[PDB]
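Ligand-bound model needed. nickel (II) ion.
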Amino acid sequence: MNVIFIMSDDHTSQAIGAYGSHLAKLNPTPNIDELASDGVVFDNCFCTNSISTPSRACIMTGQYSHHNEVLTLDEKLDVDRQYLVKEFSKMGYQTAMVGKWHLKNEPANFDYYKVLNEYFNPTFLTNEISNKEWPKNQVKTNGYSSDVITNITIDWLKNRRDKNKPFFLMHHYKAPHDMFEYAPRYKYYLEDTEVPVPESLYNQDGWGSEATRGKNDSLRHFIGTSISRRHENRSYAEDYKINTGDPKKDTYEAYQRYLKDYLRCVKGVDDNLKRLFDYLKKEGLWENTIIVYTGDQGMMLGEHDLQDKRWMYDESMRMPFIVRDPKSKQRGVHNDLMINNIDFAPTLIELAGGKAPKYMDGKSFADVFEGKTPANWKDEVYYRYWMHMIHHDIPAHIGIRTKDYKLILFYGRHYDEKTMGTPSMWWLRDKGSHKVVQTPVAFELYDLKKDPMEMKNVANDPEYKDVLKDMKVRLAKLREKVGDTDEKYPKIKAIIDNALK
Ligand SMILES: [Ca+2]
Ligand code: NI
Ligand code: NI
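Prediction:
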């Protein structure tokens, strides 16, 4: 069967109606919900490292960041590590890459590519041009990027695809990534509707730890960019220049404007999927094509007064992940198996008739689509955010999540010693940027059954003493087992080993 892998940049699970959040009553994604109504919604799909380039490298390689080497936004994925597409090509698929490309090197292992690397009249690099090589093979387009990107894929399917060969197509939207430049036809979408506000926008009593707030909350203006003006250097309230005279009203108005601009970008993607899905039905591909819809990671939409991703908190860590397999009987169902973006490539390869590659860290959960739990499937996932402080003043951390608990260890250092001591926000160099410095080392523990919104860090609660001890052992063992043991980074190894002992 064919495969279309659709991924939107920073499309978080709260903003898909099928995940049933407080936003779902706005019906933000009717066409994604219709896809979900005939497929599987995975409730427990997590990235291992919540930023665009690392997550996409995990998808492409089936490997953890410390193996594929894409630790942060700053790194590139080697061409010869484009494993997912190389495996499909080896099964005789024609391969195509369309849209937003974060992996920096040429998509050279794709038969066809037309990529960004721009919200209006985007320019693409594409090997449809004969007399120019990457990165000079550029083509200008007219119009809004979500509409243009959808047309590139439909035009490829209609006019270029070899109709006698199966295809593997990665279809990547730039929306709804910052700066949420939505198409002007959506300017008044939601204009008169209040976006539901999470109570954690204002109430953070019990959330976090000394690692994320400082002793005596001494670092709340330092760690974690904000919706409110809590963070002294970067916030939506300041960026939007909202100044009503009431800081809670400022926070409310910045939240509303953030969420509405974001949901207008989501709406543009969802409307374009109607056009793509209608084409696939008309062309006769709907019943022989596996369709995946996912976001590369989640996003904090103001929960706990936080923004962006990177955090291991569930809104950022969880990826929306919807699969419609037309040969499966799992249609209109949810599945709670604990899965990672590193599992996507082996699962897709098996769903397309191949064998899970043994050099990958991830494993195939393809059995789910036959109504069976895969053999010896993990009940915990590992998480690590490496990019200490840069851009959003979020400290580096590792963690483990089960179905029942999440344990986070903030180790609060950058792995690159030369980066320690630099400004975290380059645009505020010599304008008061915080510096990339050691932040407090602490654990956070969340009881996910009683406290799914992660409002209450119970790491220091006596009632949770045994759970904490057990979770630290589980974290220490998983980290050793996946090989993320920091021999290259002695200062961090010492912090983490000492904290887990
Ligand atoms: Ca992203
Ligand atoms: Ni990409
Ligand atoms: Ni787009």
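Residues 182 and 283 are 29 Å apart (CA to CA).
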